[PDB]
């Protein structure tokens, strides 16, 4: 098989970068800061312009002291180390990373179309074919990532950027990890967490396939299969054994979903002896041309409106905030490898 051969080459390519990561490939002063696209408890993501090229990037800025307070050091090193090493059309491209006294920076190629989350919430729900177009891309991406021993662990529409050709780029690798065995960290997003994570068992890449079922459900339904006002109530739902489908869900869609949202690991699609092929060969996917999807030759259900290079209207507005860089190095030994 050519898929295997693809994936073997992919792996050589990745391991070379994994084992010898790029470090320190730009400096903050090389970029003009334009606008905040998002904020979080340890950093923010801004639109910037690289002066030397005039290219636009999304620069993620992480406050090292906040990373340390939140016990996210290893996770942050995972994120940069994996991102600099992967290469797949549906993955955001990390063009540069560096650090200074205060902060870590990861500069990704700018995806102006915004997150799937925005377009899904506004439009309400996607048609089955529209959902399937997106789901195919996640299927290929996870097959790629998992072959490299990587677990992604934060699948949700919020992390799926829509590019100028209407294709996805996955962003936000802060919980991705290269692991051959099982792993135990409780992380992810409530609605997307597999039962074995909630129940504190060791788990593996099957959690990504359970999250795929959550995603497809949410894309085709317009709401997730398990929701409540509080996370504890969401967890009781997830572990309960019970999912209801809208009556508009095709019977094939419902059957994929029952196999993806399977509480039982020896039964979960993507986790069986035939692996990802159980999913790619499922009937819900019978019209999908996997190679044309990879090649981006399929016409997209939707192309975001682009007013021009540097537009941010597909992102929400955020209070701006100075970037102050300390005169003293913070946490140097913690982030030495970044």
């Amino acid at each position: 098989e050519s898929v295997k051969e693809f994936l073997a080459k992919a792996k050589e390519d990745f391991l070379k970068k994994w084992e010898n990561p790029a470090q320190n490939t730009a400096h903050l002063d090389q970029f003009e800061r334009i606008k905040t696209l998002g904020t979080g408890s340890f950093g923010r993501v801004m639109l910037v312009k690289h002066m030397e090229t005039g290219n636009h990037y999304a620069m993620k800025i992480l406050d090292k002291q906040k990373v340390v307070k939140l016990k996210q050091i290893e996770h942050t090193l995972n994120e940069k180390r994996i991102l600099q090493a992967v290469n797949f059309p549906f993955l955001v491209k990390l063009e540069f990373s560096f650090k200074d006294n205060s902060n870590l920076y990861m500069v990704m190629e700018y995806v102006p179309g915004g997150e799937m989350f925005s377009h899904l919430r506004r439009i309400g729900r996607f048609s089955e074919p529209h959902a399937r177009f997106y789901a195919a891309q996640i299927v290929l991406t996870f097959e790629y990532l998992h072959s490299l021993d990587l677990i992604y662990r934060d699948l949700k529409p919020e992390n799926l950027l829509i590019d100028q050709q209407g294709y996805i780029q996955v962003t936000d690798f802060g919980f991705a990890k290269r692991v051959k065995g099982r792993t135990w960290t409780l992380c992810g997003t409530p609605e997307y967490l597999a039962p074995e994570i909630i129940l504190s068992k060791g788990y593996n890449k099957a959690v990504d396939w359970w999250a795929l079922g959550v995603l497809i459900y949410e894309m085709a339904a317009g709401y997730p299969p398990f929701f409540a006002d509080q996370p504890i109530q969401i967890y009781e739902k997830i572990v309960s054994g019970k999912v209801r489908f809208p009556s508009h869900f095709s019977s094939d869609l419902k059957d994929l979903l029952r196999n993806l949202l399977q509480v039982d690991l020896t039964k979960r699609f993507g986790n069986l002896k035939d692996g990802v092929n159980d999913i790619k060969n499922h009937k819900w996917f019978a019209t999908t041309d996997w190679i044309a999807i990879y090649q981006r030759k399929v016409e997209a259900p939707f192309i975001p409106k682009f007013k021009g290079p540097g537009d941010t209207s597909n992102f929400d507005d955020y209070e701006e905030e100075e970037i102050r860089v300390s005169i003293n190095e913070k946490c140097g030994k913690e982030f030495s490898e970044f």
């Binding site: 016990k71 996210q72 996770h75 409530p190 709401y223 929701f227």
Partner: peptide, 20 residues
Amino acid sequence: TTYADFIASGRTGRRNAIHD
């Protein structure tokens, strides 16, 4: 409807990761 119960819930905006 489930759609109405969703839209009226406190989880229709961007959802935060958890950890720990």
